[PDB]
């Protein structure tokens, strides 16, 4: 049963890997979204400071 358990763990780790890579790419896009929001908020902050 050692081989069967190892094969099950390999499948589980493959699923985890795929999910983590997907989440990494999604977070990469979300960083751009957040930076865009920061840029959009910049002018009001600067002018209200003035």
């Amino acid at each position: 049963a050692t081989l069967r358990e190892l094969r099950g763990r390999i499948r589980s780790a493959g699923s985890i890997k795929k999910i983590t890579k997907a989440q990494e790419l999604i977070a990469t896009s979300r960083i751009a979204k957040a930076q865009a929001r920061v840029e959009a908020a910049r002018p009001y902050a600067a002018e209200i400071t003035n």
Binding site: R37, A40, A41, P43, Y44, E47, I48
Partner: protein, 118 residues
């Protein structure tokens, strides 16, 4: 012609030339024309902004807790939340009137003023 900029906290909303900017500061109504003097004022809690342009229709904006700054060249309107005329819904705005919460009623009044129902 003067450059009007409706700038919100979350984003810069609108920018462009205009011929006359009407609004209601704390003391009372005000109209800004091209070479108006430098000025800093606070819009009334349920204020409305009417930007009359050249060759275009009036731009009615419902403003939430905004400010006004007339500079040597441009007029800047600051807004926690500014909603353009096409985006208002009569139902919700009219319902928000007379509500227990003061801010909600003020926002509803601003929407109604923007619509023209007063």
């Amino acid at each position: 012609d003067l450059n009007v900029e409706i700038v919100a906290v979350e984003r810069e909303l609108w920018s462009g030339p205009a011929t006359f900017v009407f609004t209601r500061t704390t003391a009372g109504e005000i109209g800004i024309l091209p070479r108006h003097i430098p000025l800093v004022a606070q819009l009334v809690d349920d204020a409305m902004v009417r930007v009359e342009r050249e060759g275009e229709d009036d731009l009615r904006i419902a403003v939430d807790g905004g400010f006004l700054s007339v500079t040597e060249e441009t007029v800047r309107i600051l807004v926690e939340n500014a909603q353009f005329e096409s985006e208002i819904d009569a139902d919700a705005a009219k319902e928000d009137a007379a509500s227990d919460d003061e801010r909600t009623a003020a926002w509803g009044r601003a929407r109604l003023r923007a619509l023209g129902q007063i």
